[PDB]
Amino acid sequence: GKTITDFSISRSVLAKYEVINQVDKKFILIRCSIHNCPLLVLVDQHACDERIRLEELFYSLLTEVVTGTFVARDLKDCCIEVDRTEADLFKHYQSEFKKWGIGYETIETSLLEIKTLPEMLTSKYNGDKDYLKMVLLQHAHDLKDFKKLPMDLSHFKLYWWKYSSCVPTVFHEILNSKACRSAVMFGDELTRQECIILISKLSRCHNPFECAHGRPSMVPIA
């Protein structure tokens, strides 16, 4: 029953960290007996909040998709002109797009008739047919070029991060921007108690070491 010792160490690091206080209305100063390879760390308060918020958004989205409860809003008069190869590509991945609330029919210089769209995508598309085509083609090419693997729903606790890679790029972008916008900003006041809650929640995240956009969330200063 062997494992790689380097993976477990990353989680236990943050777990041994007590909050000092907010620094310059931008950072949360944290401090770590048995100081091996680990003392003082400054956490970006925005990156911290954005990270917690993203993982909550991802957990909600993937719980809906895996349980077949993801809302699919009915769309009218949405027909997109597609090439023969594009039409074959959409015909091939129709079943895959249904899992994300994207419901269509391939007709016949063919036509793609979009019947349903999830609420996130309905809002982003805002009637722009050229935008929607680009976004659906991007995912279809991701699938065909082995850059994204299909959503396996054959499996029956839900670890959202085991399916995180399957999420279309357009969904990732929407969740990244919602988390960024909802997050606390630089210049905002935080009490020691709010800082305690923020770091407690961060230490429970799957990846507490970066913000939603992959930039570092903390820097050791010791």
Partner 1 sequence: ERVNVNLTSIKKLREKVDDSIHRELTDIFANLNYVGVVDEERRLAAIQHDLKLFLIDYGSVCYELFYQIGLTDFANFGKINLSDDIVLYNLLSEFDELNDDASKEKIISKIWDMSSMLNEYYSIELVNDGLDNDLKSVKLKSLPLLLKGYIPSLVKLPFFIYRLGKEVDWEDEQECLDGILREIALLYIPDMVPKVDTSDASLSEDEKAQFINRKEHISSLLEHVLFPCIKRRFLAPRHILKDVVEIANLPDLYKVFERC
Residues near Zn ion, by CB under 5 A: 50, 180, 211-213
Q: Which is nearer to Zn ion, 66 or 175 (CB)?
A: 175
CB of 156 to partner 1, least distance (A): 37
Q: Which is nearer to Zn ion, 19 or 212 (CB)?
A: 212
CB of 126 to Zn ion, least distance (A): 23
Query: Where do contacts with partner 1 occur on this chain (CB under 8 A)?
Result: 20-21, 23-24, 26-27, 29, 31, 33, 40, 42, 44, 46-47, 50, 180, 192, 211-213, 215-216, 219, 221-222
Helix 45-67 × helix 169-182 angle, to 10°: 140
CB of 173 to partner 1, least distance (A): 14
CB of 199 to Zn ion, least distance (A): 18
The phi, psi pair for 208, rounded to 5°, reads -80, 0
Q: Which does 221 bind (CB under 5 to 8 A by kind): Zn ion, partner 1, none?
A: partner 1
Q: Is the dihedral of CA 145, 143, 91, 121 positive or negative?
A: negative
As a whole number of angstroms, the distance between CA 22 and CA 45 comes to 9
User: b/e per residue, 162-178, with b = 16+ CB within 10 A?
Assistant: ebeebbbebbeebbbeb
- Residue pair 84/107 in contact by the 8 Å Cβ criterion: no
Q: Which is nearer to partner 1, 87 or 180 (CB)?
A: 180
